[PDB]
Amino acid sequence: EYLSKYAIDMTEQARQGKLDPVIGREEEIRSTIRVLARRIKSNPCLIGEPGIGKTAIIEGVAQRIIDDDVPTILQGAKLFSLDLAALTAGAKYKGDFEERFKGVLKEIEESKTLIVLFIDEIHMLMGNGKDDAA
Amino acid sequence: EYLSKYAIDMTEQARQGKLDPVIGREEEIRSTIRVLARRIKSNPCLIGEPGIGKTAIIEGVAQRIIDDDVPTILQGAKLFSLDLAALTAGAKYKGDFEERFKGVLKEIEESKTLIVLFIDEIHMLMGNGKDDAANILKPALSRGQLKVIGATTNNEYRSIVEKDGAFERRFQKIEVAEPSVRQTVAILRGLQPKYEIHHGVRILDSALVTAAQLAKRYLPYRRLPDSALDLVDISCAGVAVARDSK
Amino acid sequence: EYLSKYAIDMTEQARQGKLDPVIGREEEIRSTIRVLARRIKSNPCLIGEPGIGKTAIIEGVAQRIIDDDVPTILQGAKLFSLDLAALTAGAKYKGDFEERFKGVLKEIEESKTLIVLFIDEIHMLMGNGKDDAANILKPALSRGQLKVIGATTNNEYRSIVEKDGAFERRFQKIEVAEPSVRQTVAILRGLQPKYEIHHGVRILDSALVTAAQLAKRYLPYRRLPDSALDLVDISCAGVAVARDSKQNVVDSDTISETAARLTGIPVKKLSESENEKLIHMERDLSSEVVGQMDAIKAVSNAVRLSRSGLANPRQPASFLFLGLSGSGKTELAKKVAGFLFNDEDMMIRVDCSELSEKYAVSKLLGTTAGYVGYDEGGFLTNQLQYKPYSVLLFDEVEKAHPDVLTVMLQMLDDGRITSGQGKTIDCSNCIVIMTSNLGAEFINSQQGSKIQESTKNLVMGAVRQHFRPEFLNRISSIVIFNKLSRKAIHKIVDIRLKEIEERFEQNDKHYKLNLTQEAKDFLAKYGYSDDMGARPLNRLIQNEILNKLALRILKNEIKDKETVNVVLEECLEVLPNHE
Ligand SMILES: Nc1ncnc2c1ncn2[C@@H]1O[C@H](COP(=O)(O)OP(=O)(O)OP(=O)(O)O)[C@@H](O)[C@H]1O
Ligand SMILES: Nc1ncnc2c1ncn2[C@@H]1O[C@H](COP(=O)(O)OP(=O)(O)OP(=O)(O)O)[C@@H](O)[C@H]1O
Ligand SMILES: Nc1ncnc2c1ncn2[C@@H]1O[C@H](COP(=O)(O)OP(=O)(O)OP(=O)(O)O)[C@@H](O)[C@H]1O
Known about the structure:
The PDB classes it as chaperone. Keywords: Hsp104, ClpB, protein disaggregase, molecular chaperone, AAA+, ATPase, cryo-EM, chaperone. This is part of a larger assembly, with three copies of chain A. By secondary structure, the first copy, chain A, is mainly alpha-helical. Chain A has six helices and three strands. Chain A has helices at 10-15, 26-36, 54-66, 72-75, 85-88, 96-109; strands at 7-9, 78-82, 115-118. In chain A, strands 1-2-3 form a three-stranded mixed sheet. In chain A, helix 2 packs across helix 3 (54-66). The longest helix of chain A is centred in the last third of the chain and has 14 residues, at 96-109. The two termini of chain A are 21 Å apart. Chains in contact: A-B, B-C. The B-C interface holds B 1-2, 4-6, 85, 89, 91 and C 158, 161-162, 165, 168-169, 369. Bound molecules: adenosine-5'-triphosphate (3 copies). One adenosine-5'-triphosphate (ATP) binds at residues 289-292, 325-331, 395, 437, 484, 492, 495, 533-535, 538 of chain C.
């Protein structure tokens, strides 16, 4: 699966106890849950200064998922982070990364329970004139 | 083993000697080591002006490593000087150097004892608009061992972190500075046999002192290790000519 | 016997005298032998600039083997030249490539001594996209001696190492040096009889010296092992060629002149006349440029020094032209090109008018890889690489920012200017003319047309304030052009009127120029706006003569020729009707 190559199963890291706990931040966690629970465009994004726990909050919700302290939509979820490698593995063979990325997204949508994708450094996909953003 | 195609094994050189003695830098070394011995942010930097022993420190720690004069964590560690072609070998085809950088970190990350990189010029990676522009390829894994000692002048440092913002939250600056005049002499003394051998001449101990004092009171634009050493080397070359002339 | 199908026996070639002997390469040869004598890292790699004797060493090795100057350990070996057909003989059938390398890589050790393979171009192995293109057979089998000697360009070595890795670990890199002129000549002497025999001509020993020495000075783009030979072989051919059209190689009359025909550099043509090259220069520059005689002589003399290569090998003729605008600060430069290349348009104009330290160097020298657009060299690199003794003009070099001035510092003293590409130019044989308006503040006092000593110092003051002395100290001469005395103006008016005739395409209408002294004085007197130099003379002519002429032409009041008279500054000259 492309998810095993270009992503990290954050849920599994949480499952293994490898992640630090989120202490409180309930308002932020609840906000991301409500957004994830939306009918359309269910894509929250954490905005703030660096060094304030944004990534930690997402790892936090992963833990809430691990222990089923989330809506049923999220109880069945598996959270993957997106590696920059989807693109940074190279674009020799024009369109190669576009296909790799299209590929993993296909697998994410395709049937296998609710898959949630965390893309750290989301501005990474701005793209030089979009295009690399694709 | 991508690392072996790009980096110099400082440890192997130290194992074989072929290094200058390192003088007075024990504390810079202790600090370097202390940071490397950290649980997470084990990424110290040798920072100052050119010609102040920043790479001397590395030869120094390489030797301390060879002789197990380092903490448990470093006892069996190895160190590699990288930069260079790692960013330019991929002169064609998108993502090629990026693959190398990643491959190197992979090689370092997995199994093969504790490998520490030495970046001689971190500013060269800079993070040229981030967006996978070299320096930016690192941060994801700066917690994942991949210990690295960096190096930069203060102008270069300030330029990097001001433009980046993350490196100054990932790396441990260690001030490296020119020695006192007497310490300079001790350094010159330590390198004295190197110059004497290559030029086939002697250096008076008082010449080492003169070069150290002179540099301090003569060349305001050159830091004492290089400044005094250049006064010594330049002088040695002149003497070697006299030696050859007879 | 794959080797008998795909490779050349280099010791066969040695025994048959098909290879040239080598001189001075003995230590480098010994190095390759000593590497072969190793159990590990037994494969030497000859690395250097293109042409730096890399295969000369190999060809030399073959001879050293048959001559027994090689340890018996290695002497008993045979040498073969491989690759190319070794692979391309197959095509269809996946894996044939391995099958082609495989029996070679077996026969190489099967009883019939050890065969050393020569891959003159190691860099052409590894695989185009890797593709496990039989290159894997080498490392895989490399433990069994299978000794290989190869070579690569310094640039290519870098590529080999980065592309494969294992090759760096398997091969012993060896630097191969470029010989000095003295060493080069020794090489040439060894090969001298080959050329004399091949062409049926003799070569003077001084000619060989000349080729090496001359090449070192005038062929900076080619390494001596080749450059010196190119001059010898080309020259020998030139002798045989002329002879055998419908003797010997002379140091001067053949080689010096040959090199000049090949590279340009008039000074090495050792021309028969410094009258029809220098004397006429002063006369003709003076004929067209009136006044500024001082400048003309300064240039002519600076140019004179380049004759026969007497001028400093690292310094372009160089000038800085100061003075009143309209005094010919750039016109002289064009006329110099007008003389040098017999064509004013051959001057390389450098648009210094447009400079910013952030673009100023890059538009001249271009940039490095990774930047939008390489086509380096807009004004300097792209011209100097092709025109070794061109003349450059910097129109207002004074507008340059220090970065350009730095380029000029190199240009003016050891002009091995480095292009953005990373490759140098070496333009010491060019002529550099630069201009500035700094003296305007003093020369406009009008106190004497010939620059006076007070004025001179004030002007030079400004120059020294503006440019760092480091620049000024590298200029052959700094000349402040003289102002156009009325005396000059009368001569100039005639010249200008003739110039107008000369440029008038197909002169159906042509000037009679019935100037008479009265209109000569009119143009010379009323056009003498001293503080603007001669340029206003042109405006006056356009305003008073050409406009009327054009109108009469449009009205067809003139069929040919061109009547002139003065009708009566209020007279406005006024050209007459015609027909
Ligand atoms: N419960 C928590 N709340 C806030 N921060 C925490 C918490 N637990 C751990 N942290 C630490 O807070 C730090 C903030 O870094 P984090 O990994 O969140 O990066 P960030 O805050 O998203 O900023 P960035 O965008 O530079 O990654 C982390 O280093 C994390 O170890
Ligand atoms: N104890 C020492 N060991 C090694 N080099 C030393 C020592 N003391 C002084 N030096 C001088 O300093 C040089 C390297 O040290 P230093 O870090 O001061 O230079 P640097 O500025 O680090 O180099 P760079 O410009 O790459 O940062 C050596 O080449 C040597 O001349
Ligand atoms: N001494 C002279 N004899 C004949 N014609 C001249 C002389 N000086 C100037 N001229 C004429 O006037 C013009 C001089 O041009 P030139 O550009 O050299 O003036 P300039 O001083 O270069 O202007 P600037 O200093 O701005 O480049 C030319 O077009 C030329 O026809």
